Design a protein around this ligand. Sequence first.
Ligand SMILES: CS(=O)(=O)c1cc(NCc2ccc(CN3C[C@H](O)[C@@H](O)[C@H](O)[C@H]3CO)cc2)cc(-c2cccnn2)c1
Length: 763
Amino acid sequence: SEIGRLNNQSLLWGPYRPNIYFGTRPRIGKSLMTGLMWGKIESYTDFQHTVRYTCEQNEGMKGYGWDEYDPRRGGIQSIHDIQNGLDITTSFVKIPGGAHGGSWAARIKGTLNDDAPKDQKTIVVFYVSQEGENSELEAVPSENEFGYEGDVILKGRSEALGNYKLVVTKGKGVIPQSDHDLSRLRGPGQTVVQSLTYPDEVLWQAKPILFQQLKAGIDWLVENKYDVADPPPPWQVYLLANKPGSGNVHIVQKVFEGDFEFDILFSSESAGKEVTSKDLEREVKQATEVFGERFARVFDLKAPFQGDNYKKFGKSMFSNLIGGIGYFYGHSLVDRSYAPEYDEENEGFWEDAAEARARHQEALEGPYELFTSIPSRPFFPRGFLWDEGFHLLPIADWDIDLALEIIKSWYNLMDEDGWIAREQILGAEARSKVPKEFQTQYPHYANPPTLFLVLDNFVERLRKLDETLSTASVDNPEVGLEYLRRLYPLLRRQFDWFRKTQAGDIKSYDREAYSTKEAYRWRGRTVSHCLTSGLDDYPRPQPPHPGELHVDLMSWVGVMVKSLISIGSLLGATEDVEFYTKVLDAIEHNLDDLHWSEKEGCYCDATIDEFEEHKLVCHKGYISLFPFLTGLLKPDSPKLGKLLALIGDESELWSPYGLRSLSKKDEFYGTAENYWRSPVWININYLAIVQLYNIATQDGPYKETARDLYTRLRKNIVETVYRNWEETGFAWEQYNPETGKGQRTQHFTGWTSLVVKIMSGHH
Ligand SMILES: CS(=O)(=O)c1cc(NCc2ccc(CN3C[C@H](O)[C@@H](O)[C@H](O)[C@H]3CO)cc2)cc(-c2cccnn2)c1
């Protein structure tokens, strides 16, 4: 509770706007937010097309991301913008002090690349907004007529932040000067500020708000007889008339010719003295040193990746993953009808659920907040539930207390029933990027509970001030068990929810098995998809059917029970721990009785026939290995040995680049969208690698096959991801098993970053 508050104060500020190139906000719903924009201007019409704000990936952008980041200290981002002929650095740094979550500073540096005209004009904007009823923010006017020769100071106050100043410094670089008539009314060229107000809920729409002000400037030109007989230069036509004041939006605009840089200094008044540029430089150099020392300790890359090339690779994958951390706030869109069609209980259920959806009873609810890492800045800058379990495995190593914060944040979303939506789209900003037909969440939709994996790691670590704070929840056992105590009931609630909502049907068919209880079927499947399982288009029983059972789902339930055993045991929930033991024992038996195929040598999902009998449906691939991947099989199990055969078999799963999602022998190989029907995916490869290492560092019959497989798979996965990074600068979503090429989306940090932990090893 004391450590909680120090943790709160430490993590309050950051560049928690991963959906944009660079911006800051604190972990507060309605507060002070900033964002960077820039774009070259060569003509009277180009700036609207060159300006950058929200993250994307296309031919115009070579690459971007964090070179180093720790959300407690700050870091350095590099942006390589081809369209704008610019290489940009954004350094962000936090300075603890006072009562309001400390201070921070950022340096924005732009260097023209070799291709750029040496006299390029670049428009740079720093956009500042503040939400809240009783808060103030004011631009201190300049001494000069038309703008600022020097720094722009914003004075503001709020309940959340107390008093603060935000300074945008004069910076360094040529500022262009205009000889035109207009300069007599608009100045020759200088930094300008517009202070505006809009209703709070639209402050986020920085691009349109800016353009509306640019447009009003141009309309003013037109009305005041500035025309094509004698036009002012483009960059002056797009320079806002200076009008500072008070409001909830403040636009600070600069134009530079050539290279440039400028600082942003946020000074929390309740702290000591105010933040300077010399402070920024010192704290930046200091963060880099701490970052370095920590990486070497936490991510000690083992053979054969100890080389410096692999270190830089590892730093990039890690920094981008942990650098994705966002704070999201607002309403989510949920169908709360619990239409009976969603029980999916007859044949052809998918058509019924389509009928219910077509009622559109979904409503906004909340608001909610979420502090989480994300799969990708340009495409998926929001919380995804099973993804986050993978994101936190490397993050927890770095800073267990951060990871627990993020777990707590997710768990705080769980409704009364035990449901967390698998995709968290919080507020209009988060919604803007996401197509309407994809926003609505459904309380019957599960997603893998991979967050338990992180919990498991915490538990084993538990059994055996930024320095201190990162590890306080393990160094103080008292704190640990207390965290577990408070979360334990939500864990159980989620357990029970799986069993009530994702229940399969044994009792109503000719189905025999050790337990009449244990059987699971993901709700929400369509003819070609099962989105809730995480493996979108992995082939399942055709047609889908209320009788289906899914071996991945049962294995996840297995993961959960096992975690509940350890956590219950740590808390002495004896009555609970005994029930869990009966479920574990029953899932073990039932995985065999309902899922094992002796004929095929692997696990399979099941349905019920045209003739109403249990049928196995075997599609050799990730799904086939689940009981192994999820840690459920004994190290001497013959079944495990056969899965090891399947895994290593080059003609089924084993490619030089990692395990294929689907066997080359399956009829569904490389068909359709071919998402999970052949490509190599790091998250599942990671689970294989960890399980091989387990069977490998224990006496048993398969110790040495596992040792060989472990060695080679670790090598193949790391090298594929590394080679692609070296060539393209990106982490990719998935990798082509025939060519080794990364494909689908880029900037996937993202569970692809698991590679840093594969390299570092020692599970
Ligand atoms: C044409 S698109 O670029 O594919 C595309 C698609 C969709 N909607 C569906 C979708 C959602 C997430 C994933 C990735 N991935 C698939 C994995 O199978 C799951 O296991 C993972 O949990 C899941 C998360 O990592 C894939 C598909 C949204 C946007 C978008 C959203 C905001 C802003 N701009 N664009 C773009």
